[PDB]
Amino acid sequence: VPRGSNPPPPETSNPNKPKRQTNQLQYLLRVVLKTLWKHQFAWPFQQPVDAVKLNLPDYYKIIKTPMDMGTIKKRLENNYYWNAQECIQDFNTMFTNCYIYNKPGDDIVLMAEALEKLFLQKINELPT
C-alpha cells in the first residue's frame, strides 16, 4: 500500500465562511451525530478511510468525495455549515460512497444501510 496514498482529510474549518447557530444545526450535532456515533455499526464510519492501514489501495482511485462522521462532527463544531441541508448532504455522501465502492450486500454495506435508516428516522424529527 504506497505511502502518500491517503489524501488529507476533508476541510473542517474555514474562518472565511460566515457562522450562525441554528436549532437545526444544533439538533444535527447534539442528537443526530450523537445517536449515530454510538451505534453498534458506527466504528468504520467514525474517521476518514485510511487506505494504507485498512489495505484498500484503490479506495481514493474510486471515491473522490470522501466523507465520514469524524469530519461531520468537526464541521458542526466549527460552524462550517450555514444550513442543515449542507450537513445532511455530507451524511448522504458518506452512505453513497460506501454503496459505490462496495459490492451490494457486502457486510460494510449492510452496516451503512442500518445507519442510514436510523439517520433518516432522526432527520424526520428535524425541528422548524
DSSP-based three-state secondary structure for 41: coil
List the grid coordinates of 12.
Answer: 473542517
Candidates 25-33, 73-81, 103-111, 117-125 — which segment interacts with ligand JFU by CB under 6 A? 103-111
CB 112, CB 68: distance < 8 Å: no
Q: Is 31 or 42 the residue whose CB approaches ligand JFU more closely? A: 42
Binding string, residues 1-40; x marks residues near ligand JFU by CB under 6 A = ----------------------------------------
Q: Which residues contact 25 (CB under 8 A, 6 or more apart)?
A: 76, 79, 81, 83, 84, 87
Taking CB under 6 A as the rule, does residue 111 contact ligand JFU? yes
Min dist. Cβ of residue 86 to ligand JFU (A): 21
How far is residue 13's CA from residue 61's CA, in Å, rounded to a whole number? Answer: 25
Q: Considering just the CA atoms, what is the radius of gyration of the chain in Å?
A: 15
Binding stretches for ligand JFU (CB under 6 A): 41, 44-45, 49, 54, 56, 98, 101-102, 107-108, 111
